[PDB]
Amino acid sequence: MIKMVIVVRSDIKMGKGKIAAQVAHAAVTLVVSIINSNNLRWKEWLNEWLHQGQPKIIVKVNSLDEIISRAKKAETMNLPFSIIEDAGKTQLEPGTITCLGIGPAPENLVDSITGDLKLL
Amino acid sequence: MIKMVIVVRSDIKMGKGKIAAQVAHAAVTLVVSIINSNNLRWKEWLNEWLHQGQPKIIVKVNSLDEIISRAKKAETMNLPFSIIEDAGKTQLEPGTITCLGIGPAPENLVDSITGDLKLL
Incomplete structure (x- = not known):
């Protein structure tokens, strides 16, 4: 199964409405970056992901370092990824990294990156 | 200013992560549907929306009826819209309508449909 994983930071303050916007931001940025790329493998995974729901x-x-660590892992393995920063419209200062999107890609491939994390 | 609005149901039980997943589902479905359409106006709005952050x-x-009402308004106004239903992998039964996505579209068109609703 092809899946998309979004890693959210728990150490910053975000309400459920805020979290939903950030995660949606991560997902859209990933999809658009893939469509605009020339990476055939990524496009194949994206098409399958859509077909799979x-x-x-x-x-x-709970830390920014854990997000950077996983983004580096995704990058080295040539997987699609997106680092989302706040637009600073509310509490959070603009530029604050809120979450990391990875994929879509084979779940076992993605698990070699986030298989040890707790669900939000 | 171009905006996307996602209307979430509050009368059904969904936690933080569930809500975030449903909202991301609405956002991606909207974007993909616009890219694959033959609607130039929609594509121009999408592009402006991305450039605007x-x-x-x-x-x-607080009810499913409200979701249907807003979807009808979006449809009559020829705006992109997406009715999202649960995959039934958790508490919720598959097929349960969880949220409605509208846009991206000019702020005034979107607000004429959802401007009276409270933030999640």
């Missing part, structure tokens, strides 16, 4: 896994981490 | 307004309604 857009399965998503929303997990969390 | 993908602003999203997440509001709530």
Whole structure:
């Protein structure tokens, strides 16, 4: 199964409405970046993901370093990823990294990155 | 200003992660549907929306009837819209309507449909 995983930071303050917007931001940025790419593998995974109902896994981490660690993992393995920063319209200061999107891609491939995280 | 609004049902039990997943589902479905359409106006709005930072307004309604009412208004106004239903992997029964996505579209068109709703 092909899946998309979004890693959300738990150490910053975000209401459920805020969290939903950030996760949606991560997902849209990933999809658009893939469509605008010339990476055939990524496009194949995206098409399958859509056919499978857009399965998503929303997990969390309690530090910025844990997000950077996983983004580097995704990058090294040539997987699609998106680092989302706040637009600073509310509490949070603009530029604050809120979450990381990865995929869509084979879930076992993605698990070699986020298989140890707790669900949000 | 172009905006996307996602109307979430508050009368059904959904936790933080569930809500985030449903909202991301509405957002991605909207974007993909616009990219694959033959609607130039919609595509222009989508492009402007991305350039503007993908602003999203997440509001709530307390009944399914309200969701259908707003979907009807979106449809009559020829705006992109998406009715999202649960995959039934958790508490909720599959097929349960969880939220409605509208847009991206000019702020005034979107607000004429959801401007009276409370933020989630």
